[PDB]
Every structure is written in C-alpha cells, then in structure tokens.
Amino acid sequence: GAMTVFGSLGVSWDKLQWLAAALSVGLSFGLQEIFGNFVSGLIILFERPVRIGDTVTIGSFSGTVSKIRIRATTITDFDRKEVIIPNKAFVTERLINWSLTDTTTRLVIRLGVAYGSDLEKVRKVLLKAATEHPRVMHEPMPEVFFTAFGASTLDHELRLYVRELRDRSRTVDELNRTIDQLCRENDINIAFNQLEVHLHN
Amino acid sequence: GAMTVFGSLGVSWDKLQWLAAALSVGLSFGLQEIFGNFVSGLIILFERPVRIGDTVTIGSFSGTVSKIRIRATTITDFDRKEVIIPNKAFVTERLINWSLTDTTTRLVIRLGVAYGSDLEKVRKVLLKAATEHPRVMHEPMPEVFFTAFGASTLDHELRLYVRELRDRSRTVDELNRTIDQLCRENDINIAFNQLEVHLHN
C-alpha cells in the first residue's frame, strides 16, 4: 500500500532504487547468521562427519545426537535435556565425537596410596583387578602408572580400555568395588590428608 | 518457478538485478567461514606445517593427527575421542606441535623436601636416579634445581630429557619409583603440610 501510494503520487522508483539497494544490504546483513546455518547444515549432511547414534561433545554439552536437520541439530543429553545446536557450530567450530572409526575408549581410575606402602604390591593388586574383569580389552594392555608425588598420598592411575561406549560407568563401578575389596584383603593403606602440628603451652 | 512467474508477468530482471546483487552480498557474507576454511586447508596442505603422525595441541586439545583434509582435520585424542578441527584454526590461530625437527622433549619431576634435610644428599640421590635410567638422553645433561622456598617443604625440580615422544609416561613411572626407593633407602624426609598451633585453656 505504501509503495502504491508513493508511486501514484511521486513515481520515483528510479530515484530511490539506489537507496533501496543500500538499505537492502545494510539490513539484509541480518540473514548472515541464518544462511550460514543453512549452508553448514547442508555441508554436514553431505560430508557426514557425525552420524545418528554416536556421542558428541561440543561446548561442554555431551550427548547422543538424535535427529539432524538443515537448520539445527538435536542432541539428547544424558538427562534427556534436548539440546538444539545450530549447525554453524558443527561446521565452523571444533567438536568431539567418541564413535567415529573404532568406538573404543580408554578410562582412568585414580587413587591415592600412603607414603609407607608397597608400590609393587599396589601395582600387582591394581593389575589383577583390571585383568580379572571379563570385559576390558586385552589387545591394548591395561597399565598402572605412578604419576604424582602428592602432598599427602602418592597418586596412582590405572588406564584401561573399554570397547563399548554404552557401559562406561558399570565397568568403573565393578572395577572400583574389586579394587576396594582387594585393598582391604591385602592391607593396602589408602591414607587421608595428613599434616604435622607443632604445639606448645 | 518463482523467477519464471515473475518474468512472464512483470519482466523486471533489469529492474531488480541491483537488489539481487545487494542481497547477494549481504547474504553471501555467510560463506566467509567456509571459504576461509577451504583456503586454510589448502594452505596447510601446501606448506605442511604439521604432518601425519605427530602430536598437536591447539585449544587444550592434545592428540595425534590422523587424517588431514581440505575442510577439517581429524585428531585422535589420547582417549580416541576424535576431534574435528576447522583448518582456519590451524592457519590463522597459533598451535603447538611436539614433533617438528628433533622429536625430543624435556620433562620435569617435582618433589618436596623437609626443611631439616640435606640438600646435597637430595641432589645426589636425584641425579643418580636420573642418570641410572637406560633411556634418558645424555647430550643435554639432566639437572636438579632448587627453585622454591615453599610454605611447608622446599621444592625441587629434576628437568630431564627423553628423545622418544611415545613413552613419556613409563619413564616418569620408573623414575618416580626409583626416586622413592632411593629416598626410603637413604632416609630423605618428604614432609607433608606443617603448621604451628598455640593453645590455651
């Protein structure tokens, strides 16, 4: 209606078309964030860097991608808190996916040992607990590492492997239970924080 | 279809081509993030700043680069959490690579000693433990440094060298085990946190 009113009285389309074009660019630089999203979605769909069913972490948002679209991707979190992520972050921003070519993952079990202990006994107990599990992988050998002279307790890390991304927590539960039972049986001290006080009067 | 309908009724291509060009730039500034990625990938491929098989750290993401492409680079993390990084961060953003010209690295072993100890004895024990290893390099001499008058314990650092980037942790394990054994043998006190309390009533 405004265009018709202006044309029927002023008729200056050939006069304000340049202003229209300048305003058009100055105000259509608002669609960059949308067209980039669309192009990123198309690129993701064509290249297939992530597939449906794997675990993806981006921006401290780890979860299983459920549906992929041309505008936004839906990731079901571990609490079914559906996260909607623009595909521009999927294309032009770095991400992590845990199931790409080998669907295997290593996990660490950290513990502290008292200063007056037996490092060889602790290593044997940890290795036996890791090996006795009927699920941990054997081709990559699980190892125990002495990695830190802690302020109160020496730090020990057991880096061991799981080939299934689903049960990454039940294995940790069983391993920790077995480690605690073996430590209690073999009398390995897991000391608390320690300090020395000098007192007078 | 819309173009044909507009042309067959209005025929104003020569009238809205300027608006088309303005919108084209305003909405094709959405491909900057993609073309920069492509050009960065091409530049990385030509210049070869990083090769396949070395260890690269960028944005707190350290791992071994597996495949390099024109759009995104794949880095297998230490947990096989495949990180997909746009090559724009590889070209226009700083990074670190541990295997460029000499594939060697120095590592530090930190420990604390009690105030009432023998600094010369501690230095001798640390140097003997560092030297007795059959892997640490000898051309750069390993040294022990007294670097901090700590609040509770004096801080000692052993900076020693490894020429292989693969076994950077097993050497640390063996060195720490040997250091602990030698300290226990020679009676060197690794004190905990200490404080003094004044009490009354």
Author numbering:
A (entry chain A), B (entry chain B): 897 to 1097
Paper text:
The E. coli MscK (EcMscK) channel, consisting of 1120 amino acids, contains a large N-terminal periplasmic domain (PD, ~500 amino acids), a transmembrane domain (TMD) with eleven predicted TM helices, and a cytoplasmic domain (CTD) analogous to that of EcMscS. The MscK channel forms a symmetric heptamer, with each subunit comprised of three distinct layers: an N-terminal periplasmic PD, a TMD with eleven TM helices, and a C-terminal cytoplasmic CTD. To better understand the biophysical underpinnings of mechanotransduction and to establish the molecular basis of dual activation in a ligand- and force-gated channel, we have determined cryo-EM structures of EcMscK in distinct functional states by leveraging GOF mutants.
Thus, the cryo-EM datasets of G924S in NaCl and in KCl were essentially indistinguishable, which allowed us to combine the datasets to further improve the reconstructions of both the closed and open conformations to overall resolutions of 3.84 and 3.47 Å, respectively. The final atomic models fit well into their respective densities and were refined to good stereochemistry. The lower resolution reconstruction of the WT channel is nearly identical to the closed conformation of G924S, and hereinafter the higher-resolution structures of G924S are primarily used for structural analysis and interpretation. Akin to EcMscS and AtMSL1, the pore-lining helix (TM11) in the resting state is kinked, and several bulky hydrophobic side chains point to the central pore axis to create narrow constrictions. A hydrophobic gate near the cytoplasm is constituted by V921 and F925, which are conserved amongst MscK homologs. In contrast to EcMscS and AtMSL1, an additional constriction at the periplasmic side of MscK, with a pore diameter of ~8 Å, is formed by a ring of seven tryptophan (W914) residues.
